[PDB]
Amino acid sequence: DTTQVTLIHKILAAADERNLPLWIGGGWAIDARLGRVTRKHDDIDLTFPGERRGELEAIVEMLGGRVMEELDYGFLAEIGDELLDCEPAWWADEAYEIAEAPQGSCPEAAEGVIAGRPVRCNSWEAIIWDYFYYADEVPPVDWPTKHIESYRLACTSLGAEKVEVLRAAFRSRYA
Ligand SMILES: CN[C@@H]1[C@@H](O)[C@@H](O[C@@H]2[C@@H](O)[C@H](O[C@H]3O[C@H]([C@@H](C)NC)CC[C@H]3N)[C@@H](N)C[C@H]2N)OC[C@]1(C)O
């Protein structure tokens, strides 16, 4: 989908110009770390510096969009027909971190690629951690296929053993 891919470029170019880091998350982050589009994506998940929220809102507005809805964890925005699902990360000693996520959730290095361009994305461990929360809200056997396949793909990329010990850590945290 050329519109989403073009929109991701436009957002990141604008953010780059003002030295605003943004991390692609969710489905697109998986595809970015793989360097391959694997399916249609329903939205664009973004992680932003929480104390610079206004700068991200201003880029959304510059691009002709607007903030649509506040959620418990962040906010949705709409640029044309495309949805941006935006969550804050907060400065933690020497890096931004998503609250309660595994350390390294928001690496300063651009470790994914989208349409040949390096992009910052959330770590595999942070991608997978959000599926653990999802699992407590819906059993994995009850997930839409696309989400099962995306999870399994992230898990194979990181390594199944690394996933199972991360899952044990999640269970310990939230026991
Ligand atoms: C707009 N739809 C979103 C969906 O994309 C999905 O959003 C996830 C959202 O579920 C996810 O939240 C998780 O992490 C939250 C918190 C620990 N992050 C610091 C607590 C809730 C937990 N589900 C966020 N980290 C990332 C966000 N893109 O789930 C909620 C939702 C409202 O259906």
Ligand SMILES: Nc1ncnc2c1ncn2[C@@H]1O[C@H](COP(=O)(O)CP(=O)(O)OP(=O)(O)O)[C@@H](O)[C@H]1O
């Ligand atoms: N109802 C829900 N409750 C909690 N977490 C959810 C959720 N639905 C999905 N998630 C988690 O939040 C992440 C982002 O969710 P979504 O944006 O809704 C789907 P996605 O994996 O990004 O595919 P997409 O590319 O088609 O949007 C998912 O990767 C999953 O980890």
Ligand SMILES: [Mn+2]
């Ligand atoms: Mn998504």
Ligand SMILES: [Mn+2]
């Ligand atoms: Mn989303």
